[PDB]
Amino acid sequence: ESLSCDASGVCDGRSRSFTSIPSGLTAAMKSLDLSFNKITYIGHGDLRACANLQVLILKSSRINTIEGDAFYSLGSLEHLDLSDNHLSSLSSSWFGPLSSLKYLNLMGNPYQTLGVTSLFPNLTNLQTLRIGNVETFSEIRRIDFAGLTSLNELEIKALSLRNYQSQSLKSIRDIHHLTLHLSESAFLLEIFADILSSVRYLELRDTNLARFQFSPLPVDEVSSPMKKLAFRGSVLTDESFNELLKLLRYILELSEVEFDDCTLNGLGDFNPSESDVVSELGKVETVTIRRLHIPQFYLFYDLSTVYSLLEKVKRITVENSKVFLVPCSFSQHLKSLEFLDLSENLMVEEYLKNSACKGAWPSLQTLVLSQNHLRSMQKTGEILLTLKNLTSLDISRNTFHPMPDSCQWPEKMRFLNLSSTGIRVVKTCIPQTLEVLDVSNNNLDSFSLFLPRLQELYISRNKLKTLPDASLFPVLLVMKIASNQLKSVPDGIFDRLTSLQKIWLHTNPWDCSCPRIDYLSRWLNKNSQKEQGSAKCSGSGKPVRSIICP
Ligand SMILES: CCCCCCC/C=C\CCCCCC(=O)O[C@H](COC(=O)CCCCCC)CO[C@H]1O[C@H](CO)[C@@H](O)[C@H](O[C@@H]2O[C@H](C)[C@H](N)[C@H](O)[C@H]2NC(C)=O)[C@H]1O
Ligand SMILES: *[C@@H]1O[C@H](CO)[C@@H](O[C@@H]2O[C@H](CO)[C@@H](O)[C@H](O)[C@H]2NC(C)=O)[C@H](O)[C@H]1NC(C)=O
Ligand SMILES: *[C@H]1O[C@H](CO)[C@@H](O)[C@H](O)[C@H]1NC(C)=O
């Protein structure tokens, strides 16, 4: 029914049921959000009063027509969201005065094209521009981006693209993040050609790339600034994937590639060894795959090409893609790998054993097996001994059987993550070479392991009623024990932790009074730089920083 505006000039008119921009706008309003309304029309004078407006949010109202001079007095507007409305036609007049515009969102409107007039030439301070839609935006023309030199973000949703005019994206000098929504590989070659000098991070969404083909690009040998290339919901084939890899000859500085919810169903499988791009990841050091869907491995593949292709990569992530095995042979060829993340898969000791064979992941430093199907700490550790260079292991979120007294872990292991592992007690299975141990969110009663080199302990989210003994952590820099049900700490205890720099004590039922917690209180008070978060007293949300009894 009405506008709710604060003393900062931030006005909120969302979700009322306005059929037009309300009246009474002032010169003191800084942000006006009239989203999710029913403003079918924006006339010449509606926004004339609020000349100091910096933010105008008008998402999902039902705007279908706006007068060319509707924003004539918004010379300080920096943010304008017209997404998800009923604009069939865009008008350059809107933007003529918005010289301060940094953000503009016209995405989600049923326009077919940007119109026969460059819309953005006066937007000299523009940083984020999102345009397009799912079903009707079908053309991108050469006049479309005239005026713009550089952008942080440029998102173009054109899942219905039917015509891309060559040279359109080429006029922009610098685009840090370009997000493209393409349903087919139809104009990929030319769009790609037009951004070789400008895009540092290209992201392609929802493209069926199964019939993509490569052919040299009629361009000049120029140094491309692309560092990251990401494919979100693509459909690939073994044959098209190889066609895509040839584009790397144009992005020599590419160093990171991502594949999210992609499908890969290579049917015919390439053959011509000459038209085969191998060992061409160039300087790609990070390969990041999430939720990949392969139909079914039934026949022997080969991987000679993949061995070569992954030969110099240092970071690989294959997350939540139902992985149950990485063949030994594969692992032995990943010679430069330092980080490997198999979070959320189906690894069990039985198959890990083959995956971590003798010459497996020779340079591996960090291994993440969070959320898999591991059940035995003793076997996991034994299998991993082959990883001579391993310094950190994350086996959190695996429900392990109670650990034994004696175990064997890689010689140089300093970081061990046993968080959300379900353990009830900790035993000398955990090695003493450890500098970092996470046993948070488990079913612990106490901790009695002497770990001489422990620099950090995470024991938060457990049932410990009393702080573990301080003689167990001579060189401890960090202790986390929030959410644990501690009522008090021994007086002067922190003098005994001669290295402590950070400690988490919040979310415990501290007992505040006069004859107790006088130490904790004062210590926390004069060590605010050390306490992370804040321990509050019980029976009173008041923090444990309350002077008591003179
Ligand atoms: C830089 C260039 C790019 C470099 C990229 C490097 C990437 C390296 C890692 C890639 C991993 C991709 C595959 C992930 C995966 O885990 O794929 C499964 C098998 O994985 C392997 O065997 C190892 C292949 C290594 C290839 C290396 C290139 C498929 O399993 C399929 O075949 C299995 C029998 O073999 C079936 O049991 C399974 O059935 C499925 O099992 C499910 C667990 C569930 N029960 C389903 O219901 C079931 N399907 C049914 C029953 O219809 C089915 O999905
Ligand atoms: C040990 O592994 C756990 C489990 O994944 C990590 O905890 C997650 O941390 C991220 C970012 O800090 C959070 O978004 C999640 O909510 C956490 N999950 C859980 C278990 O609550 C934890 O950070 C790892 N420990 C260290 C020191 O790296
Ligand atoms: C582990 O990694 C280092 C660094 O690449 C490598 O040089 C060394 O040979 C590896 N150690 C073993 C035993 O393979």
Q: What is the DSSP string of 463-483?
A: --SSPPPGGG-TT--EEE--S
The residue nearest atom 10 of ligand 3, judged by CA position, is 363
Task: Please give the number of the atom of ligand 1 that sits closest to the Cα of 303.
Answer: 28
Q: Vertex 20, ends 14 and 22: CA angle to 5°?
A: 65
Closest-lying ligand to the alpha carbon of 312?
1
468 contacts: CB under 8 Å, gap ≥ 6: 446, 447, 448, 457, 459
In the block, tokens 């000459």 appear at: 274
The tokens describing 187, both together, are 């104009």
Q: In angstroms, what CA-CA distances link 38 with 14, 19, 45, 105, 276? A: 10, 5, 18, 19, 56
Contact 218, 195 (CB under 8 A): no
Q: In angstroms, what CA-CA distances link 106 with 2, 46, 79? A: 26, 20, 12
Ligand 3 center–CA 10 separation, angstroms = 58
Pocket perturbation via mutation, ligand 2, pick of 392, 395, 396, 439 by most ligand atoms within 8 A of CB? 396
Q: Which of 287, 291, 295, 289 is nearest to 315 (CA)?
A: 287
549 contacts: CB under 8 Å, gap ≥ 6: 514, 518
The residue nearest atom 7 of ligand 2, judged by CA position, is 419
Ligand 2 center–CA 446 separation, angstroms = 21
CA torsion through residues 473, 474, 480, 484, sign: positive
Task: Please give the number of the atom of ligand 1 that sits closest to the Cα of 322.
Answer: 16
Task: Please give the number of the atom of ligand 1 that sits closest to the Cα of 323.
Answer: 16
Contact 165, 187 (CB under 8 A): no
In 38-121, at which residue ranges do the beta strands (DSSP E only) sit? 41-42, 55-57, 65-66, 79-81, 103-105
The residue nearest atom 30 of ligand 1, judged by CA position, is 296
Ligand 1 within 6 A of CB of 306: yes
Q: How far apart are CA 44 and CA 111, in angstroms?
A: 22
Query: At residue 202, what is the residue type?
Result: L
Contact 74, 98 (CB under 8 A): yes
Ligand 3 within 6 A of CB of 389: yes
Task: Please give the number of the atom of ligand 2 that sits closest to the Cα of 461.
Answer: 21
Closest-lying ligand to the alpha carbon of 329?
1
Q: In angstroms, what CA-CA distances link 76 with 95, 98, 120, 226? A: 12, 7, 16, 33
Phi-psi region of 547 (alpha: psi -120 to 50; beta: other; left: phi over 0): beta
In the block, tokens 């009474």 appear at: 24
Length of the chain: 550
Closest-lying ligand to the alpha carbon of 334?
1
Q: Vertex 207, ends 202 and 208: CA angle to 5°?
A: 140
Ligand 1 center–CA 318 separation, angstroms = 11
Half-sphere exposure of 544 (CA within 13 A, CB side): 31
Partnered with residue 57 across adjacent β-strands are 33, 81
Ligand 1 center–CA 374 separation, angstroms = 18
What is the β-pairing status of strands 339-341 and 315-319? parallel
Q: How far apart are CA 322 and CA 348, in angstroms?
A: 12
Contact 78, 55 (CB under 8 A): yes
Task: Please give the number of the atom of ligand 2 that sits closest to the Cα of 420.
Answer: 20
Half-sphere exposure of 342 (CA within 13 A, CB side): 20
Q: How far apart are CA 170 and CA 541, in angstroms?
A: 59
Ligand 1 within 6 A of CB of 309: yes
Closest-lying ligand to the alpha carbon of 358?
3
In the block, tokens 């300087």 appear at: 283
Running DSSP on this structure, what letter comes out for residue 256? E
407 contacts: CB under 8 Å, gap ≥ 6: 377, 378, 381, 382, 428, 429, 430, 431
Closest-lying ligand to the alpha carbon of 436?
2
Pocket perturbation via mutation, ligand 2, pick of 417, 442, 462, 481 by most ligand atoms within 8 A of CB? 417
Q: How far apart are CA 220 and CA 229, in angstroms?
A: 21
Ligand 3 within 6 A of CB of 338: no
Dihedral (C-alpha) 444, 447, 453, 459: value to the nearest 10 degrees?
Answer: 40
Resolution (A): 2.5
Ligand 3 center–CA 512 separation, angstroms = 54
Pocket perturbation via mutation, ligand 3, pick of 388, 391, 392 by most ligand atoms within 8 A of CB? 388
Q: How many CB atoms lie within 10 A of CB 432?
A: 11
Closest-lying ligand to the alpha carbon of 335?
3
- What ranges do the domains of the chain cover? 1-550
- At 319 the three-state DSSP class reads strand
Consecutive H or E run containing 437? strand 436-438
Dihedral (C-alpha) 312, 316, 322, 325: value to the nearest 10 degrees?
Answer: 50
Ligand 1 within 6 A of CB of 10: no
Q: Vertex 340, ends 335 and 346: CA angle to 5°?
A: 120
